[PDB]
Design a protein around this ligand. Sequence first.
Ligand code: NA
Ligand code: NA
Length: 327
Amino acid sequence: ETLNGGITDMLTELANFEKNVSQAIHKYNAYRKAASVIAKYPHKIKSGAEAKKLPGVGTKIAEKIDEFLATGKLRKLEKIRQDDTSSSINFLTRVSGIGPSAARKFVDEGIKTLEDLRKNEDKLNHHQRIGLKYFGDFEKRIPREEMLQMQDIVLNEVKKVDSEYIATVCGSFRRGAESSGDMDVLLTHPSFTSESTKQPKLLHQVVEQLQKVHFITDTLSKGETKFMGVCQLPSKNDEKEYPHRRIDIRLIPKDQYYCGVLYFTGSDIFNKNMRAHALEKGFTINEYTIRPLGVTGVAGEPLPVDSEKDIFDYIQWKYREPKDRSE
DNA sequence: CATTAGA
DNA sequence: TCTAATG
Ligand code: NA
Ligand code: NA
């Protein structure tokens, strides 16, 4: 956690690199398992050899470890860090819609910069066009203060269309958090569950609503159960207009809301731990349900959940407020 | 780890 | 269809 930080740190850097710039899923995979193990390791790594004794620890990495242990740097690391081409990939990739593949292709064509990016909007698909377009806005955190105003709004339409609609804004926001990156709204409805062969219109009505009033300005992706978009609070009585905010809303089979909702709420560690627990308590948890465990090794049979509670209850725990879902 | 675009 | 990008 700190005794092995640098090593892991350089390691991740290393890894991350093969992955994006190069197409070395392998090496890239190498660096990570190794990064994973040395991380665990209970002691100050003193040399390659020592490290080497490890699992996933080859001679390639031992080597890197020593040079880094000796000199507070790495050549390959310095070289990469410098590398323009490589610097460029790492950067374009910020655009919502640009991933490694496309980042490399763009470079190869010569789009290393944002401007380049612009001159060549034609070379860009709608997801990316918008990624570029709200680039600033997208990089910016979400003041809870605004979170609250947004939420206030969705809740209002959700209900205005059909009153049956259930919506929860999950995420860190839900976990109390001061700021957030984007708003995640978990949607569900009674007339929609496990079986009852969809009802696409269900998603589609609200989207149409939200856009109806100008809360949604753009569509990133919108399908029968997950709409990816762009929202924005009404820029008031002028002088201060609002930043453009990422927003995702999902339709949920009513029969598996709370497990889903439980989950998206996290935190990433609270989950695991929660999950780790259900297991002892003879269970299984995952993104949609919770099934009693059978001693044959495995077992099925999705228990019925009416709220975040049932789920606790089942695994027989203390209901923990979203606020303290930290770990 | 599953859902959407796109070509 | 596969393959990419987001979460
Ligand atoms: Na990106
Ligand atoms: Na393949």
